[PDB]
A paper describes a structure:
[name] (CHS) and chalcone isomerase (CHI) catalyze the first two committed steps of the flavonoid pathway that plays a pivotal role in the growth and reproduction of land plants, including UV protection, pigmentation, symbiotic nitrogen fixation, and pathogen resistance. Based on the obtained X-ray crystal structures of CHS, CHI, and chalcone isomerase-like protein (CHIL) from the same monocotyledon, [name], along with the results of the steady-state kinetics, spectroscopic/thermodynamic analyses, intermolecular interactions, and their effect on each catalytic step are proposed. This study characterized the enzymes involved in the first two committed steps of the flavonoid pathway, CHS and CHI, and the non-catalytic protein CHIL. Through crystal structure, molecular docking, mutagenesis, kinetic analyses, ITC, and FRET analysis, our study provides evidence supporting a revised catalytic reaction mechanism for monocot CHS and CHI and identified an intermolecular interaction of CHS with both CHI and CHIL in a non-competitive manner.
The asymmetric unit contained two mutant PvCHS molecules, as observed in the wild-type PvCHS. The overall RMSD between the mutant [name] and the WT PvCHS was small, with 0.26 Å. Nε2 of His-309 was 3.84 Å (vs. 3.2 Å). The noticeable changes in distances are associated with the shorter sidechain group of serine than the oxidized cysteine.
Residue numbers in the entry:
A (entry chain B): 6 to 395
B (entry chain A): 8 to 395
């Protein structure tokens, strides 16, 4: 009645670009070393008699380029739940009972670290973006995390369920609009993935699911995003310049994922590394041409480590310097494939190594960077990042 | 090129505007007057006469005249596990909704896109919201294919949201259309009850009441900033958007996706809790605008149930005409979860047209859209009508 909508819009809106104010990561305590996983996995699933199948899983884990992973699932638990140890056995209820609890709990550990580095009180958080691919529930994990952290009972929550490995970029793309369109907004972004929904025994008939057993790991990464940082009170890490999403052509059913009574099952049709390599440059050009940037070796890289073959085939297609994917490959080695949370681990790794290596910026000395998310549909999320002087 | 130069050229200017609304439902229509007989027949529960009497009272007090349901008596005959109260059936239910949910959303999206009149290539964002099943790639991907939208459309997949997500999608579309020059957000809420349909159980009347209220439907809305005065005709403006959790409302509405499907659980007094807090939500949204006469703003309230509307309307002594659109959608469609408030929007502007009302908001200037759902979550969207 007093103010007009244009006056509200003018007042409501923020200035400046969405900025990463803090990054925090967390994993389950239980740590499984990749060198020992073929024996561990084949023992807990009672499959040591399938010798030829175990030999293939050994080479699978050898090619994985993963040194270790963290998993909430323990041998003691798995001994009590043979329905989650067989390849195809009704067990979704058992799996949901775990993830609907542990996924929010692990996200709290990651967000607690991000908030402590942030230094501001939780009460300043105005937006919560929670993303997971491990189970669904109502109220969602976003509700669980809010209660666990004690966030304001008016936080604008966004719950990303069953998204897939590309959601790491989707959450940044979402946070970018939330922080930039609302003046004092402070967005807590949380990705949390626990493999208890996809863990299952081996089968010589469904080898695509076997690679998942060699790559998927548990973990959560939290990020605090906001525009117009408070100087001397907040420490800008990266800037979210732009975000785009796209579907690669001829990639229709490349990676399918179905939530059934046997839990979450993944199905691999078509060459995923090849499909990404053939089109990565086109994604790079769409995001950096209006920027006047052509040298793909002049920008710091953040790529979802879906598998070592994806990294190799993209690094070879565009002739990347082997230092550009150093942070990406490092996270894959110490954590495995953690689905959406992976790209947020690499961000934390890149900035951590940069400050420890005396780089000029948080982006390995470079100014501009690119963040790639890869997942079902052959969806590619592309986020143009910018570093901050160190 | 510096980041600041990007930000200035990349963000939109005016307020987020609803440019079109389209709705769609399954063909099969089921009349509330016959549902007690039908429901207890297909579920083979006619031996529970005392229960059938309770259900009949549920349906008669529901203020629902008819509902649309993809589930047919023929299909239910071939799937007795979905007619039982608790029997393994998630695979069967998923097989339906992963296919029909995007398809029903396509029917509504076609309508909306037609009224919009612009080429489908101009759609830059897609927000897909459903509580009926999950899949990878999600329903957003299937709809992108079905509609022929551009690859590179920015998709947001809202799975397993609940009955408050009608407001959620608007909140999302608002920030998307306002921060990005040229963005045109296609918003689709699509719900199908084949994931919650189940037989009756004397020990769980709360699940039984869901069987009397929930219905199928999809609604599409096209949201954009800075409309084209020539090619585009605005319908509503999204001024603000806010979500909040209601105190002492823990466990009021729970929903679990299990091997027997999606089961709903009811604790506490949902209408009493929403009525007890509705005035705080109004004041929080409208006090900074100088508004305090709830009778002089149009209303779009999620019709989670008749009691909710009655008790909210009684709390603020609402002019009974303020809920006519909400209650009509409830009567003619039932509780379609997230899509409800969008159906109500469409019925508001349409009734506003054939009535000779000065605005799309029943002649009024400012309005409120409420979404109610699990966590006792309340979404509050402040709207502004458009002159007719």
């Amino acid at each position: 009645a007093a103010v007009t909508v244009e006056e509200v819009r003018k007042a409501q809106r923020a200035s400046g670009p969405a900025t990463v104010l803090a990054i925090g990561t967390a994993t389950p305590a239980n740590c499984v070393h990749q060198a020992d996983y073929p024996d561990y996995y084949f023992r807990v699933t009672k499959s040591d008699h399938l010798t030829d199948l175990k030999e293939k899983f050994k080479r699978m884990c050898d090619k994985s380029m993963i040194r270790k992973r963290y998993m909430h699932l323990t041998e003691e638990f798995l001994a009590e739940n043979p329905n989650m140890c067989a390849y195809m056995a009704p067990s979704l209820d058992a799996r949901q009972d775990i993830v609907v609890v542990e996924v929010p709990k692990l996200g709290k550990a990651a967000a607690q670290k991000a908030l402590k580095e942030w230094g501001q009180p939780r009460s300043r958080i105005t937006h919560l973006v929670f993303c997971t691919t491990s189970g669904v529930d109502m109220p969602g994990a976003d509700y669980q995390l809010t209660k666990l952290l004690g966030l304001r009972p008016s936080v604008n929550r966004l719950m990303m369920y069953q998204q897939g490995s590309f959601a790491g970029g989707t959450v940044l793309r979402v946070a970018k609009d939330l922080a930039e369109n609302n003046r004092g907004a402070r967005v807590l972004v949380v990705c949390s993935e626990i493999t208890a929904v996809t863990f299952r025994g081996p089968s010589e008939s469904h080898l695509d699911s076997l690679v998942g057993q060699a790559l998927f790991g548990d973990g959560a990464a939290a990020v605090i995003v906001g525009a117009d940082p408070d100087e001397r009170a907040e420490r800008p890490l990266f800037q979210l310049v732009s975000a785009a999403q796209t579907l690669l052509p001829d990639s229709e059913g490349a990676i399918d994922g179905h939530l059934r009574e046997v839990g979450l099952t993944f199905h691999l049709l078509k060459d995923v590394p090849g499909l990404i390599s053939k089109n990565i440059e086109r994604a790079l050009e769409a995001a950096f041409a209006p920027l006047g940037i052509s040298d793909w070796n002049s920008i710091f890289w953040v790529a979802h480590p879906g598998g070592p073959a994806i990294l190799d085939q993209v690094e070879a297609k565009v002739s990347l310097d082997k230092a550009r994917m150093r942070a990406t490959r490092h996270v894959l080695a110490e954590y495995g494939n953690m689905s959406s949370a992976c790209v947020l681990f690499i961000l934390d790794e890149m900035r951590k190594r940069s400050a420890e290596d005396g780089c000029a910026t948080t982006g390995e000395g470079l100014d501009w960077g690119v963040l790639f998310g890869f997942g079902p549909g052959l969806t590619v999320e592309t986020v143009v990042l910018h570093s901050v002087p160190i």
